[PDB]
Design a protein around this ligand. Structure first.
Ligand SMILES: Nc1ncnc2c1ncn2[C@@H]1O[C@H](COP(=O)(O)OP(=O)(O)CP(=O)(O)O)[C@@H](O)[C@H]1O
Ligand SMILES: Cc1cn([C@H]2C[C@H](O)[C@@H](COP(=O)(O)O)O2)c(=O)[nH]c1=O
Ligand SMILES: Cc1cn([C@H]2C[C@H](O)[C@@H](COP(=O)(O)O)O2)c(=O)[nH]c1=O
Ligand SMILES: [Cl-]
Ligand SMILES: [Cl-]
Ligand SMILES: [Cl-]
Ligand SMILES: [Cl-]
Ligand SMILES: [Cl-]
Ligand SMILES: [Mg+2]
Ligand SMILES: [Mg+2]
Ligand SMILES: [Mg+2]
Ligand SMILES: [Mg+2]
Ligand SMILES: [Mg+2]
Ligand SMILES: [Mg+2]
Ligand SMILES: [Mg+2]
Ligand SMILES: [Mg+2]
Ligand SMILES: [Mg+2]
Ligand SMILES: [Mg+2]
Ligand SMILES: [Mg+2]
Lengths: 186, 189
């Protein structure tokens, strides 16, 4: 069977924390789970390369997509096929928010590139950890464009996105994610 | 302004040889020339990425395209804007032949990705050094693959017969260079 879930938001919005808490909840229920992330879940070398260089947004998107293409084929789809709940800390929506809304790349192009890269794989639910940039643990204008881009995406796909106030305490956010997830188990 | 030229063909077809000859030939005529290549002209580290074992053909193309996007923006468009003859040893047609005909990726997707990557930039002429596939001898680059790529290049040449100049790669180096030069004479000046 398999269940594909993602977490999205600005750096320091609590994604890795909530990813780790969601995996733990699922383990306590006896459900096999796989935790993964972008960038680097497909091509670790893309992550390291982008850490130290800044490229055109078009080149950056394409590297993020090459990583994503390997990630879907070698990690995510095999995980789903084995019946795992696969949780990715960032997925396509990260490219849409950062390279699209942030850097100005056209979204329909981004999605056409993604179409083969992802084999059209979409998560069943996406938890958006929403907060202002100055509440996170370029320039500020960029991060505002990203944050608002995420909320734009969420608004267009209310079936898939769950928007959470990421400034709330950690345990409270975790329980909110759990409540949304329950109807899709066991 | 400026003139955009490319060379294409299989591994081992002589395109580096002819690209370098042409660059020197044009520079001897007092013409400003920028000699470049793919992969690596945009993002030199992509050659490392491309070597990754068991790469999906989709990721493989996406890596070529990342390099190409950076290459066009940072090297080719500024060279052409300064009035240079820019010569690229491989460009987008390499992807169409290798990733499209070779690996089997759908051509329209390849082109849609390319459209932003290249910003629509096409060479004025492309010199295809047509080499028999057995003479060519990434992963899976055996005979069946090279046959597909070789024929792929020939189909691309037929689809765009004004852009592509197809040359017999087995001819002596000086004969091919002379043929390339003759095709260029009407554009230069
Ligand atoms: N017309 C010709 N006849 C015979 N040999 C030739 C030739 N032109 C080039 N060569 C030789 O063939 C070999 C490969 O040539 P070259 O490296 O220029 O091809 P290419 O650039 O298409 C290789 P690749 O795609 O692997 O980078 C070299 O040893 C070169 O000296
Ligand atoms: C996955 C992904 C991440 N990013 C950015 C967001 C983060 O700032 C950075 C990843 O950071 P990390 O490797 O330090 O987690 O990459 C994009 O811009 N586009 C994408 O598609
Ligand atoms: C530019 C380009 C090269 N190639 C291939 C040709 C060679 O086999 C290899 C380039 O290797 P090289 O960097 O050692 O010349 O990449 C493609 O498959 N697609 C492309 O778009
Ligand atoms: Cl985070
Ligand atoms: Cl998606
Ligand atoms: Cl909330
Ligand atoms: Cl031109
Ligand atoms: Cl033509
Ligand atoms: Mg951020
Ligand atoms: Mg959680
Ligand atoms: Mg990525
Ligand atoms: Mg993508
Ligand atoms: Mg997502
Ligand atoms: Mg949306
Ligand atoms: Mg060469
Ligand atoms: Mg390239
Ligand atoms: Mg391309
Ligand atoms: Mg070309
Ligand atoms: Mg053609």
């Amino acid at each position: 069977p398999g269940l594909f879930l993602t977490l999205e938001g600005l750096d320091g919005s609590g994604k890795t924390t909530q990813a780790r808490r969601l995996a733990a909840f699922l383990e306590a229920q006896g459900r096999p789970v796989l935790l993964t992330r972008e960038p680097g879940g497909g091509l670790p070398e893309v992550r390291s390369l982008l850490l130290t260089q800044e490229l055109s947004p078009e080149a950056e998107y394409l590297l993020f997509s090459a990583d994503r293409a390997e990630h879907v084929r070698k990690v995510i789809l095999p995980g789903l096929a084995a019946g795992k709940v696969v949780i990715s800390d960032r997925y396509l929506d990260s490219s849409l928010a950062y390279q699209g809304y942030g850097r100005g790349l056209p979204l329909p192009w981004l999605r056409e590139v993604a179409r083969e890269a992802t084999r059209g794989l979409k998560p069943r639910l996406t938890f958006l950890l929403d907060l202002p940039p100055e509440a996170a643990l370029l320039g500020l204008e960029f991060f505002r464009r990203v944050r608002e881009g995420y909320l734009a995406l969420a608004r267009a796909e209310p079936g898939r996105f769950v928007v959470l106030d990421a400034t709330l305490p950690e345990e409270e956010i975790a329980r909110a994610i759990q409540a949304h997830l329950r109807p899709l188990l066991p």
